[PDB]
Amino acid sequence: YEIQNAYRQGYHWVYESDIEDFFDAVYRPQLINRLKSLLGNDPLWEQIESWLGQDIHIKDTIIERTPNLGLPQGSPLSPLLANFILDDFDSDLETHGFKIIRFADDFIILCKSQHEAQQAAHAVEQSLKEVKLSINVEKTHIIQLNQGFRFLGYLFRTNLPPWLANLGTKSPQPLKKSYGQIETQGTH
Amino acid sequence: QGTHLVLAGDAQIITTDNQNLIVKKDDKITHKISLEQLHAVTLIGLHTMTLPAKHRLLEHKIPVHIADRTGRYLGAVTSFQPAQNNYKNWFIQLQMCDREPFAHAIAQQIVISRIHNQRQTLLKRKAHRKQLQQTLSNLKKLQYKVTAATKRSSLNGLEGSATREYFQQFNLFLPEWAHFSKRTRRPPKDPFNVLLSLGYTILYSHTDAILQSAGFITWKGIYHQQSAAHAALASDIMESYRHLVERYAIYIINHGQIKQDDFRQEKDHLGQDTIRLSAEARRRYVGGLINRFQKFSKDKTLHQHLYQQAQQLKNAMHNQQSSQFQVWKELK
Amino acid sequence: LVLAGDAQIITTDNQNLIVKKDDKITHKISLEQLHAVTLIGLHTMTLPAKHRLLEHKIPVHIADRTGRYLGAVTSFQPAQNNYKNWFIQLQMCDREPFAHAIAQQIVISRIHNQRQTLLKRKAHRKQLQQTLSNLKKLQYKVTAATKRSSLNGLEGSATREYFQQFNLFLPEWAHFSKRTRRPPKDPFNVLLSLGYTILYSHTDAILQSAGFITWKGIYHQQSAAHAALASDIMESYRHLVERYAIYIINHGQIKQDDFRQEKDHLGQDTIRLSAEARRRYVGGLINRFQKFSKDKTLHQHLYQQAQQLKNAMHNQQSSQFQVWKELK
Amino acid sequence: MKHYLICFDVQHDKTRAKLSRLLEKYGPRVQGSVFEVSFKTPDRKRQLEYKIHQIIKQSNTEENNIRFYNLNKDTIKHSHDINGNPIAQLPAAIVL
Amino acid sequence: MKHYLICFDVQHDKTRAKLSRLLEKYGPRVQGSVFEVSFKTPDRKRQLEYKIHQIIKQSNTEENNIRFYNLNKDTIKHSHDINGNPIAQLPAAIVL
C-alpha cells in the first residue's frame, strides 16, 4: 500500500538499495552530537573522528577529503553509523524528488525522474578527468576530492549532493490491464 | 622547404598582392613573404583572411592549419599533396615509439637537456652564486647519472630529485609576500603555483598544436604513458623548454608588473577555497608570455623552432638512427 | 548544402549556419541536419564558422568559377578517436594483390561503361564500329595486366580513343580533341569539369561519413588536389556527367551565349559560366542524381558500395566488393 | 487505420471554444490544446476536416494554424516525455 | 539522425518564456507553442532535457507537460495542413 501510494504521488522509478551510495554525504558533527546526546559525554568520540578523517597514500600522492564530511568506505564502523543517521537525508531527498521506504532492516529508493542523477554522474566524470590531467601535467601532489572515491582507481590505472552521483552510476527500474501494442485492424 | 609562418598574436589581417602574402597588424606590415618561399601557415586564434589570399594559397598547394584560441588543433585547408604528409608517417611512429633502444636513447637525451637547462637558469643570476654553488654541484652530480640509467623508473626518480632540488631555492629570489614553501597543490593556495600553472598550460597547448601540424600522432609517447586526458608526445617534448615559464614568472614578480592586489581570494561552486588571478592581470600575463614566446631568437620564433625539431625527429624515426635527433640544450 | 550561386557570405550562430547575400538572409540551416557543403565560386566563410564546422567534422570542399578543384577543409582526428578503421585501411591499401584486384575491377568497369555509352548512338553506328572494337581489344588486355603500373596507361589510352569520338555528336561550336584539365580552355570541357566536382563532393562526403580516410587511394597513387579514394570510386559513375553534358548541349538548354571569357591573374584565356547557367547546370545534375535506378538514389547506392568495400577490406577478401558495371 | 494528432492555435475567443467543444468527442484532450485522433477510412478524416472548416468560417479572420501530424507504430515506440514514460501508446487487447 | 516535435503548455508565461527562448535555436517555431527539432546524436537530446529540467526546477511548479514526438520519413509523408499543404518536409540538396 505504501508503494502504491507513492506511485500515486508520482514516484514512478525505483533504484537498487545500497547504503554504500550514502557514505560520501555524511556530515560528521551532527552524528557526533547525536551520539553525545544518547551515550553521554565521553573521551571516545574524539578518537572516533580520528579514525574517520584520515588521508589516503597512493604512489606518493596524498588524497584527502573535505573537512567534516564523509565516511571512509572499507571500514567497520561505517555501515553501522551510516544507517544510524540516514533519516537526516529525508529533506535533502525531498527537495530533489526522492523518497525512501524502510522495511525489514532494509529500504528502497523512489524517484520521479532520472536527470539530476545523470548530470551529477557526468559532472563527477569530468571532474575526475581534469584531476587526472592536472596530475600528469602540473605535477600536483596533494589532491583533495569531495566526491568520486569509488572510481579512485581511475586516476592511477551548481552543486548536487554527493549521493546523487552514486545513484546516477546505476540504471533505475520502473515499478483495464492492457496486453500489448495495437494491431493493423484494431484492439480486441 | 621555406618559411613556415605562424600567427599566434592578436588579430592580424592577411592579404595577398597576387605574388606575395602580406600580414598587417593595425595597418603596419608585419610580414611580407613571397609565395615561393612559403611552406605552410598556422592560425592560432581569430585572424581574418581575405578571400584572394585563400584562393592563391590553395592554388599553390600551401596548407593552412587552423587551430583554436587555446591551442586545440582542428583541421586544415589542404589538397591532395599537402595532406599526404599528415598520414604518410603514422605507421613508422607506432613502430619506433615502442622499440626500447631508440625510445630510451631519446628519453635519455630529453632528461639530459632538462637538467642542463635548469642548471643554466641558476647560473644566470650571478648575485647569489655563493649560496648556489652547492646546489649546482648537486645538479651536476644528478645529471651525470642519467647517462647510464637503463630503465624508465630510474629516469623518473632522477628527474624528480632534480626538480625538487631546483625548486627548493626560489625563496631567495621572490619578495616577502610571495614566499612559497610546500609542493604544488591542485587547488592552489599560493600565487607562484598559479603563475606556473598558467604558463605550463599555455606552453603545453601550443606545443601540442605545433606537433600535430607536422604530421604526428600525439597520444603515442616515447617517454610518458600512453593515456587519455593528455597528449603524451606534447607533454614529452615540452620538458626541454620549461625554463622559459619559470624565468618569466620570476621576472614578472620581481619587476612589479604583478602585485599582491591582483590576486583574488574566493570559493568556487564546489565550495573549496581558492586564490586566483584577476581577469585584467590574467590577460596581461598571457600577453606577456606570448611575447616572450615570440622573442625566442632573432632568426626563428619558438613555433618555427618546434616545427624544425619535429621534422628532425621525423627523419630520425625514418632512418632508424637514434642520434640524428639533437635536442635543444641552451648552449651559450 | 551547395553554394553555386553568386557571392554568398556564410556566417554562424553557434547553433545555425546563416547565408547572407548583401545583408539579406537566404538560409538559416541547423547544424544538426547539415551533412557537407560545397563552395563553387567566390564565397566567403567566417573563421568561427570554420571552427564550428571543424568541431562537428562536417566537410567543406572549395572550387573556383571555372570549376577546377582547389581543396578541402578536413580534420584528421577520427570519429570517436577510434583509430581502428583508419589503421586497417592504411594497412590494406598498400597490399599489392588486394589493391591490384580492386584496381583491375575499377578499370574493367570504366572501360565497359565507356564501350556501352558509345553503343547507344544508333545513327552513327557506321562511324563508331572500329573504335568500339579497339576498346574491346583494350579491355581484352586489362585482364592480362599483371602489375598495377600498367593500368594507368591502359585507362589513359581508352579515355583518349573514347573522347576523340565526341566530335561527331556535338555541334561545331563546341568541338574539342583533348581533355584539358587544370586550365579548362574549351566550351565543352567546362561542363565536365564542373560536374566532376559535384560528383566528387558527393562520394567524398559519403565515404568520410562511412568511416574512411579519403586521402589514400587504391588505384590513383599520384593525384593533383583530388582526394585519391573518392576520385578512385567515382571512376565507374562518371558517364552520368559525360551523357548529361551531351544532352544539355544538344537539346538546346545551354548555348554559347552563356560562356564568359576572361584573362585571370596573369593573363590566360579562361572560359566560365555565368551564375544563372551554373545554377541551372548544377540543379539539373543533382536532379539527375536523385532519379537513379528506381528504389535507390545515388547517395543510397554509394553508401551501399562503401559498406561493401569496408566489408571487403575487413575480411581481407577482394571478391566481396563488386563494381557497378552498368547493364549490358 | 491512421493515427493523427491535431494541434491548433486560434486567437478568436469563441472560435477556439467551438473547436475545443468539437474535437473532444473523437479523441482525448491530451494536452491543453493538442488532441489525438484515430481514423479507419480517410472519408471519416475528410468529414472531420469539413466540420473544422465550417466552424472556423465564423472567425472572419481566416486562421489556418491547424496541423495534423501523423503517428506510426515505431514512431509511437520511440516517443517519450522527459521522465521516460512512453506516450501515445495504445492497447492490443483489453481484458477489462 | 532523428526528427522530433516539441510541444508544451506551461501555466505561467514568464516561466515558459525561457522554455520558448531556449527552444528557438534548436528548431523553427512552426506554431504558437510547437517546435520542429532535428537531432544527430542522442547526447544533444540528453543535454536539452537536462536544461529543460533546470528551468522547470527554476519555475518550482513540477511541470511534466512537455511532450516529444517522433517524425519518421514516411510519417512526414502523410502529414499535412488543413488545406492539403505538406508540412515538416526536409530538403535533400539545397542548390542555393
Numbering used by the authors:
A (entry chain E): 436 to 592, 617 to 634, 641 to 653
B (entry chain F): 650 to 981
C (entry chain C): 654 to 981
D (entry chain B), E (entry chain A): 1 to 96
Provide excerpts from the study.
The structure of the resulting Cas6-RT-Cas1—Cas2 complex was determined by single particle cryo-EM at an overall resolution of 3.7 Å. Approximately half of the complex displayed relatively lower local resolution, and refinement using a mask that excluded this region generated a reconstruction at 3.4 Å resolution with improved interpretability of high-resolution features. Portions of three Cas6-RT-Cas1 chains that were excluded by the mask were then rigid body docked and refined in the full complex reconstruction. The final model consists of two entire Cas2 chains, two entire Cas6-RT-Cas1 chains (excluding five poorly resolved loops), and the Cas1 domain from two additional Cas6-RT-Cas1 chains. Extending from the Cas1—Cas2 core are the Cas6-RT lobes, which are positioned orthogonal to the Cas1 domains relative to the central Cas2 dimer. The Cas6-RT lobe is connected to its associated Cas1 domain via a flexible linker, with the RT domain proximal to the central Cas2 dimer and the Cas6 domain closely abutting the RT domain. We observed density for the Cas6-RT lobe in two of the four Cas6-RT-Cas1 protomers (Cas1b and b’), presumably due to flexibility of the Cas6-RT domains in the other two Cas6-RT-Cas1 protomers (Cas1a and a’). No density was observed for the DNA substrate despite co-migration during size exclusion chromatography and indication of binding from electrophoretic mobility shift assays, suggesting that DNA was bound in only some of the complexes collected or that the DNA was lost during grid preparation or is too flexible to see. The most notable is an RT α-helix that serves as a direct connection between the RT and Cas1 active sites. While the N-terminal end of the RT-helix α9 is attached to the β-sheet containing the RT active site, the C-terminal end points into the catalytic Cas1a active site center.
